[PDB]
Amino acid sequence: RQFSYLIENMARDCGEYAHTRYFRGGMLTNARLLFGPTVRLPDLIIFLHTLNNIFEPHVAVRDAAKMNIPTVGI
Amino acid sequence: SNEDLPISMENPYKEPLKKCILCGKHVDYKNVQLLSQFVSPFTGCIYGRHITGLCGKKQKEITKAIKRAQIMGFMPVTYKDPAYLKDPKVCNIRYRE
Amino acid sequence: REVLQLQEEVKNFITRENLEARVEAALDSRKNYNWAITREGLVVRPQR
Amino acid sequence: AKHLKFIARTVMVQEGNVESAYRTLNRILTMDGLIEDIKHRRYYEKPCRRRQRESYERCRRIYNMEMARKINFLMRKNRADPWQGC
Amino acid sequence: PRYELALILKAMQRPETAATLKRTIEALMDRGAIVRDLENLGERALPYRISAHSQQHNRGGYFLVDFYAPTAAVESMVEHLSRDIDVIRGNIVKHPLTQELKECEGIVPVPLAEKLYSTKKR
Amino acid sequence: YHEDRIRAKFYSVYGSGQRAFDLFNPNFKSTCQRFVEKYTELQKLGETDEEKLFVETGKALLAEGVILRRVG
Amino acid sequence: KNVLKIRRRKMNHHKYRKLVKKT
Amino acid sequence: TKFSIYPPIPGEESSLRWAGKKFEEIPIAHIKASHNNTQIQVVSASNEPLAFASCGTEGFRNAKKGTGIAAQTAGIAAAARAKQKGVIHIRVVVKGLGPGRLSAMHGLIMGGLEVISITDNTPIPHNGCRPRKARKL
Amino acid sequence: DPPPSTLLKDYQNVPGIEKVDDVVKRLLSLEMANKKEMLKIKQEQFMKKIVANPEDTRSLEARIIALSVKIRSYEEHLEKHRKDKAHKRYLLMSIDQRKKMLKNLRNTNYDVFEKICWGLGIEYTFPP
RNA sequence: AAACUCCAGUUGACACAAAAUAGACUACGAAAGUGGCUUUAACAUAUCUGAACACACAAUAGCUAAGACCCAAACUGGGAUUAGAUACCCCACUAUGCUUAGCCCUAAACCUCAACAGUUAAAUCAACAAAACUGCUCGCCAGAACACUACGAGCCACAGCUUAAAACUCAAA
Numbered sequence: 006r007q008f009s010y011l012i013e014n015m016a017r018d019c020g021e022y023a024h025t026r027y028f029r030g031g032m033l034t035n036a037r038l039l040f041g042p043t044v045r046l047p048d049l050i051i052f053l054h055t056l057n058n059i060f061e062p063h064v065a066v067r068d069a070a071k072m073n074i075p076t077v078g079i
Numbered sequence: 080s081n082e083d084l085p086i087s088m089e090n091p092y093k094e095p096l097k098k099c100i101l102c103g104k105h106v107d108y109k110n111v112q113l114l115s116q117f118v119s120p121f122t123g124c125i126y127g128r129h130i131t132g133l134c135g136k137k138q139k140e141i142t143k144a145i146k147r148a149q150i151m152g153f154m155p156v157t158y159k160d161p162a163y164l165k166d167p168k169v170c171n172i173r174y175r176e
Numbered sequence: 177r178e179v180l181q182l183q184e185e186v187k188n189f190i191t192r193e194n195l196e197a198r199v200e201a202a203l204d205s206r207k208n209y210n211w212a213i214t215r216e217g218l219v220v221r222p223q224r
Numbered sequence: 225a226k227h228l229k230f231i232a233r234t235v236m237v238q239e240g241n242v243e244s245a246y247r248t249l250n251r252i253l254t255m256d257g258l259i260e261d262i263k264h265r266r267y268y269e270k271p272c273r274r275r276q277r278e279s280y281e282r283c284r285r286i287y288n289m290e291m292a293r294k295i296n297f298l299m300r301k302n303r304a305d306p307w308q309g310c
Numbered sequence: 311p312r313y314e315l316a317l318i319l320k321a322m323q324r325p326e327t328a329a330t331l332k333r334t335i336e337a338l339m340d341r342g343a344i345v346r347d348l349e350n351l352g353e354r355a356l357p358y359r360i361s362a363h364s365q366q367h368n369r370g371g372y373f374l375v376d377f378y379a380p381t382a383a384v385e386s387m388v389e390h391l392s393r394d395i396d397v398i399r400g401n402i403v404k405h406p407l408t409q410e411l412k413e414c415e416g417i418v419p420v421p422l423a424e425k426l427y428s429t430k431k432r
Numbered sequence: 433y434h435e436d437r438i439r440a441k442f443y444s445v446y447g448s449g450q451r452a453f454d455l456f457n458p459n460f461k462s463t464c465q466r467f468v469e470k471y472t473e474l475q476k477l478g479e480t481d482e483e484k485l486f487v488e489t490g491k492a493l494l495a496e497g498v499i500l501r502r503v504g
Numbered sequence: 505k506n507v508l509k510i511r512r513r514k515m516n517h518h519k520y521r522k523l524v525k526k527t
Numbered sequence: 528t529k530f531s532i533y534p535p536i537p538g539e540e541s542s543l544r545w546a547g548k549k550f551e552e553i554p555i556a557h558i559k560a561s562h563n564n565t566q567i568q569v570v571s572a573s574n575e576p577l578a579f580a581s582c583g584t585e586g587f588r589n590a591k592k593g594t595g596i597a598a599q600t601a602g603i604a605a606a607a608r609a610k611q612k613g614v615i616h617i618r619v620v621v622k623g624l625g626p627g628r629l630s631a632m633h634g635l636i637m638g639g640l641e642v643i644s645i646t647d648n649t650p651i652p653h654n655g656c657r658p659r660k661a662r663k664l
Numbered sequence: 665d666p667p668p669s670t671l672l673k674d675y676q677n678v679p680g681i682e683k684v685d686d687v688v689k690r691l692l693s694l695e696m697a698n699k700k701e702m703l704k705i706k707q708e709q710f711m712k713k714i715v716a717n718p719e720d721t722r723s724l725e726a727r728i729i730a731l732s733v734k735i736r737s738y739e740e741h742l743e744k745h746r747k748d749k750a751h752k753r754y755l756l757m758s759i760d761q762r763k764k765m766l767k768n769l770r771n772t773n774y775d776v777f778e779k780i781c782w783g784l785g786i787e788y789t790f791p792p
Numbered sequence: 793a794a795a796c797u798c799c800a801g802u803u804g805a806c807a808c809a810a811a812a813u814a815g816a817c818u819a820c821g822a823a824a825g826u827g828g829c830u831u832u833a834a835c836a837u838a839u840c841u842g843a844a845c846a847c848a849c850a851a852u853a854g855c856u857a858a859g860a861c862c863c864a865a866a867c868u869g870g871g872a873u874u875a876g877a878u879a880c881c882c883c884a885c886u887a888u889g890c891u892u893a894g895c896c897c898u899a900a901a902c903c904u905c906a907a908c909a910g911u912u913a914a915a916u917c918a919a920c921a922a923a924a925c926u927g928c929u930c931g932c933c934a935g936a937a938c939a940c941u942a943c944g945a946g947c948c949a950c951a952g953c954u955u956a957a958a959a960c961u962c963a964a965a
């Protein structure tokens with residue numbers, strides 16, 4: 006949360022997207038229902054923080070591998 | 080190669096291991112003034128190592144010495160000799176408050 | 177070295193000849209084995 | 225019996241405040257363990273039952289000490305949210 | 311071996327106290343002892359009332375007798391102290407100065423036990 | 433490192449002094465580090481014993497104006 | 505765990521000891 | 528000076544007096560707090576019986592004796608027989624963890640007696656005799 | 665049984681102990697010692713009598729001598745403490761460990777086997 | 793309620809019984825087991841493994857004999873509850889528990905996890921519990937029940953222990 010503001014601004018500055026909020030189950034593995042059938046998922050996910058707030062791996066790390074999305078992580 | 084690489088060494092900043100108050104001293108059964116420092120003043124019960132702060136080896140020397148001094152006619156059992164009530168308190172126990 | 181030290185001590189040992197004299201000396205002096213300890217680890221000898 | 229009377233388990237009363245003396249006396253007997261010992265000695269506790277109770281009391285202490293040690297370690301983080309809004 | 315006789319005598323006068331000490335030290339020599347010293351711890355009040363030889367005592371004299379004797383002299387000397395009417399209580403123990411104390415380096419910290427339960431999501 | 437032995441002894445004898453660290457400043461030299469530099473410099477001279485080398489290093493800092501108050 | 509296999513031996517043994525006392 | 532909770536040892540001379548009497552001279556109130564009764568006996572320093580009272584002697588029966596109201600009544604009745612003999616200050620020696628352990632002490636205060644000390648002399652063995660078996664009720 | 669006047673194993677070697685007081689020689693004897701100081705002298709006597717090199721104590725010959733002195737120690741303890749089952753098991757196991765030593769020594773060096781059996785008075789017996 | 797009423801309380805004298813606290817310790821011993829004090833003796837083995845039966849041990853209960861006796865306490869007796877109460881609750885008392893000398897030889901004798909040596913990598917592993925394996929050896933086990941049975945043999949055991957089947961029966965346990 007400390008860096009949530011900074012990351013969101015950079016994404017807008019570089020014409021890219023961000024998700025620093027609570028990850029609702031299904032963003033990636035169920036995008037068709039949530040967004041629509043013709044939705045286009047990310048081609049690259051950059052993890053600035055791979056852990057969540059209870060010191061466990063972010064769910065998107067595992068969900069991005071299921072959707073064959075390459076991940077970059079610190 | 081490089082000379083800035085670290086070297087295999089034991090921790091020099093390590094602090095010496097802590098010692099109990101009775102470390103290096105001889106615990107005799109005739110020193111009732113020292114044995115009364117580890118017993119309750121009202122019941123005469125022997126205190127534990129969480130109160131006395133002694134080590135396992137010295138806590139058993141006080142216990143063995145108290146039991147021997149009690150049955151020999153050197154130390155009371157049901158109470159603490161009033162003479163040793165104004166001695167330095169080393170045990171972590173507060174009754175009144 | 178232990179034998180040499182013991183050889184000196186044996187002289188002081190009580191004997192039948194000096195038994196009566198030693199008893200009187202014991203009845204005049206006193207030995208105190210009592211000493212307390214503080215929280216710092218210091219021995220507090222009794223002021224007697 | 226063979227010991228001197230009015231030394232053991234004796235508490236003096238200050239300014240006629242007997243209640244405080246009895247509360248003080250009862251706190252000395254509980255901290256030393258006499259109270260519960262007198263209650264467990266009314267009926268014979270078989271060795272097997274006494275060994276089952278000592279284990280339960282030792283495992284509860286261990287758990288309660290660690291549970292308390294974590295509560296005192298995490299009480300620093302009970303302050304207000306510094307990133308309110310993120 | 312080297313023993314220590316914690317002797318608690320009956321509260322008497324000097325002439326009778328010295329007669330008992332000598333009578334007690336001669337019993338050790340008769341059993342093969344090599345008496346080394348005779349310390350006086352002074353006359354004090356007993357921690358509890360001691361009943362010996364049809365007498366209730368409240369005071370007594372404390373005397374230590376350091377000596378050397380064979381192992382078989384302890385059982386013979388413990389039976390001699392039970393018949394003496396001026397000896398309240400007397401115990402023979404191995405001298406504490408013949409027991410070297412191993413040097414200590416300090417308290418060794420103990421880390422909490424690990425790997426007591428399997429790392430499975432119960 | 434080899435200078436950790438020298439630091440451990442400086443802190444015990446003298447401890448962290450009044451001067452406070454400035455971790456932000458990358459090129460910040462503490463009083464203890466200054467002691468280590470002199471100690472190392474005097475080793476290059478050839479002295480092979482710590483006790484004399486340690487005592488001789490302190491005197492130089494005192495001459496340079498450094499304050500080295502012992503735990504006393 | 506249950507003691508359903510111990511209870512069968514419990515009655516078997518009780519019925520056998522009660523028959524030896526009768527005969 | 529200050530105030531200590533430890534009883535004044537007889538030998539060493541002190542200045543604590545009650546009506547001109549030393550701690551040793553004060554009479555003693557022996558309370559036996561049982562589970563079904565509470566007996567009270569006041570004695571002097573020279574072991575001379577002055578007063579005796581109990582829940583049974585006050586007209587209580589069976590399960591009324593193991594209450595705090597019966598113990599208080601027996602304390603008032605023992606504090607009225609000893610107050611006629613010149614008793615004001617007493618040393619309480621309670622024996623037992625019964626209901627009338629503290630209630631009898633209040634009844635003694637409601638009879639004109641002033642308590643200077645509270646002694647506990649509950650019999651605790653260092654294992655001796657074996658108690659009765661636990662019950663299933 | 666070594667006389668009670670015998671000096672201890674350690675002290676006898678020290679020089680200058682021949683000319684001292686009679687009281688110092690009585691405190692360094694076996695009379696003022698325990699039973700384990702007399703067993704250390706019995707073992708010393710057997711080694712000189714039997715083994716070629718006494719200094720070596722890790723040899724099979726020495727171990728048999730050291731264990732036979734313990735066996736005798738237990739027989740003296742069990743003649744007074746008949747109901748001591750603990751020391752009755754230490755004796756029977758020690759007699760079985762010595763038989764395993766005599767078998768391995770009889771299979772390697774029969775010359776020493778006769779020497780030890782004669783010195784210690786052991787009548788070797790074959791198992792059933 | 794019954795019981796006791798030479799009863800209860802204080803004080804004092806007074807054990808062949810049992811061993812608060814310490815012990816939040818985690819030790820000794822083959823296990824069983826062992827926690828008041830002192831003293832004596834004393835705790836096998838310089839490869840491992842190795843027995844229902846050989847050899848020696850083995851909680852409690854129990855037998856035989858002679859002693860002790862505070863308390864507890866199967867049986868029994870009394871009181872009460874209950875539809876009944878050969879139980880649970882109350883009281884009392886005995887065998888027994890103790891000692892000595894012999895016997896008996898059992899246990900949920902279960903840390904249900906054999907002994908020795910070794911590893912933490914790989915396929916981590918049905919589940920649960922106390923993570924998963926390797927090497928070597930001894931012992932044991934092959935549906936349930938009949939069956940801690942019957943017979944035989946052996947044993948100071950004579951209502952006993954150990955070893956230990958089958959037939960009828962079911963299609964599950």
Ligand SMILES: CN[C@@H]1[C@H](O[C@H]2[C@H](O[C@H]3[C@H](O)[C@@H](O)[C@H](NC(=N)N)[C@@H](O)[C@@H]3NC(=N)N)O[C@@H](C)[C@]2(O)C=O)O[C@@H](CO)[C@H](O)[C@H]1O
Binds near residue numbers: 962964
């Ligand atoms: C899958 N079959 C289950 C099984 O049925 C079994 C059941 O078998 C029963 C035998 O006839 C009877 O003699 C038998 N009775 C005996 N005294 N031995 C029963 O124990 C047996 N039941 C059982 N093992 N669970 O009854 C038989 C007629 C059955 O249907 C044969 O297939 O057991 C039944 C419960 O008994 C279940 O309801 C069935 O679902």
Ligand code: FES
Binds near residue numbers: 135415417
């Ligand atoms: S710490 Fe060294 S003896 Fe207690």
Ligand SMILES: [K+]
Binds near residue numbers: 902
């Ligand atoms: K178990």
Ligand SMILES: [Mg+2]
Binds near residue numbers: 512515
């Ligand atoms: Mg059946």
Ligand SMILES: [Mg+2]
Binds near residue numbers: 653654811828
């Ligand atoms: Mg005890």
Ligand SMILES: [Mg+2]
Binds near residue numbers: 842
């Ligand atoms: Mg083997």
Ligand SMILES: [Mg+2]
Binds near residue numbers: 843
């Ligand atoms: Mg076989």
Ligand SMILES: [Mg+2]
Binds near residue numbers: 844
């Ligand atoms: Mg068997």
Ligand SMILES: [Mg+2]
Binds near residue numbers: 850
């Ligand atoms: Mg048995």
Ligand SMILES: [Mg+2]
């Ligand atoms: Mg029996």
Ligand SMILES: [Mg+2]
């Ligand atoms: Mg009874």
Ligand SMILES: [Mg+2]
């Ligand atoms: Mg009935």
Ligand SMILES: [Mg+2]
């Ligand atoms: Mg009886």
Ligand SMILES: [Mg+2]
Binds near residue numbers: 901
């Ligand atoms: Mg068991």
Ligand SMILES: [Mg+2]
Binds near residue numbers: 906907
């Ligand atoms: Mg095996």
Ligand SMILES: [Mg+2]
């Ligand atoms: Mg089968």
